[PDB]
């Protein structure tokens with residue numbers, strides 16, 4: 001997992017569950033409580049799991065619920081770290097550029113394993129967006145979309161169109177109705 | 179020196195002087211011309227000094243001039259590798275966070291010499307910035323500042339106030355005048 005992203009997660013966790021829950025979770029995997037993760041670093045995805053497992057144990061929330069909440073809230077954190085992605089833009093525009101954005105933010109990191117997020121028009125008033133990744137981060141994905149709707153003040157309708165697992169890759173396709 | 183930084187230099191050096199000069203400079207120190215430096219690796223400063231010494235010989239450029247040019251061009255490289263450090267930000271913002279950023283980027287390293295780059299506003303349209311380091315990379319520092327101005331498209335005047343050892347530490351104090 002890319003450093004900058006995990007950095008946004010720590011902040012978002014603090015925003016959601018408080019400094020003590022987070023400080024404690026970070027210590028449990030052996031980090032400094034106030035560690036600042038830099039864009040440079042590569043965080044073991046299993047360390048992330050364990051941090052999140054601790055958060056779950058401390059809050060009493062199921063880990064998948066944590067991911068959902070982290071997804072919704074992280075949009076807000078993004079809008080502060082990367083304001084140009086949000087400024088003078090519509091939700092549709094935002095969602096549609098996402099696939100490109102993730103290629104851009106990842107492409108001196110090899111092996112570059114960024115999630116695919118191709119969005120397409122499938123009628124006059126809606127998109128299909130397909131998440132594709134070995135990581136199987138469905139709740140996070142759905143959370144971010146809810147967070148984007150929240151952020152742009154645009155109520156949307158989200159329905160799962162299909163799901164799949166092949167050759168190591170997981171996929172989830174949804175229909176987003178404005 | 180932090181491995182990833184050296185990564186940026188190799189790229190920048192290719193952009194400036196071409197693959198042949200870079201390929202050969204790397205080989206002169208027993209490297210593979212295409213070596214990729216992981217975020218885990220640290221590179222010995224002397225290996226860096228030697229690489230740059232070959233670039234100097236090959237291009238016929240004085241090495242301080244090389245450092246100057248690399249500093250200027252490395253900002254562009256940085257902007258491609260570390261977008262988050264540039265995102266939604268202006269020159270003054272960028273410059274003044276630099277000291278903290280450098281501490282953060284080396285904090286995971288055992289014995290930690292990052293340059294210090296304390297800035298402070300000294301007037302309406304000016305900050306003072308002091309480079310402090312054992313490494314004495316004066317031209318690189320100046321280059322990065324110049325490169326930043328070009329990148330953030332914000333014109334500045336750079337007055338070099340003082341430069342010298344004081345002590346054990348090389349020091350370079352600049353006053354950076356913004357138009358506005």
Ligand code: HEM
Pocket residue numbers: 001002004005078082085095098101102105106112113114115117131133134135136137140141144145148
């Ligand atoms: C400006 C807004 C956003 C920024 C700057 C951003 C950036 C990033 C970055 C740098 C990563 C790390 C990727 C890697 O290391 O492979 C990531 C991961 C991820 N991104 Fe975003 N993202 C944004 C919004 C979104 C949105 C709107 C979605 C979906 C609707 C999304 C979906 C995901 C998912 C699911 C991951 C986890 C990686 C995986 O599952 O393979 N992101 N994001």
Ligand code: HEM
Pocket residue numbers: 179180183256260263273276280283284291292293295309311312313314315318319322323326
């Ligand atoms: C995103 C932008 C930047 C990044 C990611 C970055 C990162 C780094 C890193 C990781 C090092 C290695 C330090 C070590 O291993 O001890 C370094 C060295 C250095 N940095 Fe930066 N830097 C950035 C911008 C700047 C700027 C704008 C300046 C000056 C205004 C600067 C000044 C220097 C200098 C002069 C060195 C040489 C090391 C020394 O003299 O001791 N950097 N930089």
Ligand SMILES: [Cl-]
Pocket residue numbers: 045048049
């Ligand atoms: Cl995970």
Ligand SMILES: [Cl-]
Pocket residue numbers: 223224226227
């Ligand atoms: Cl050197």
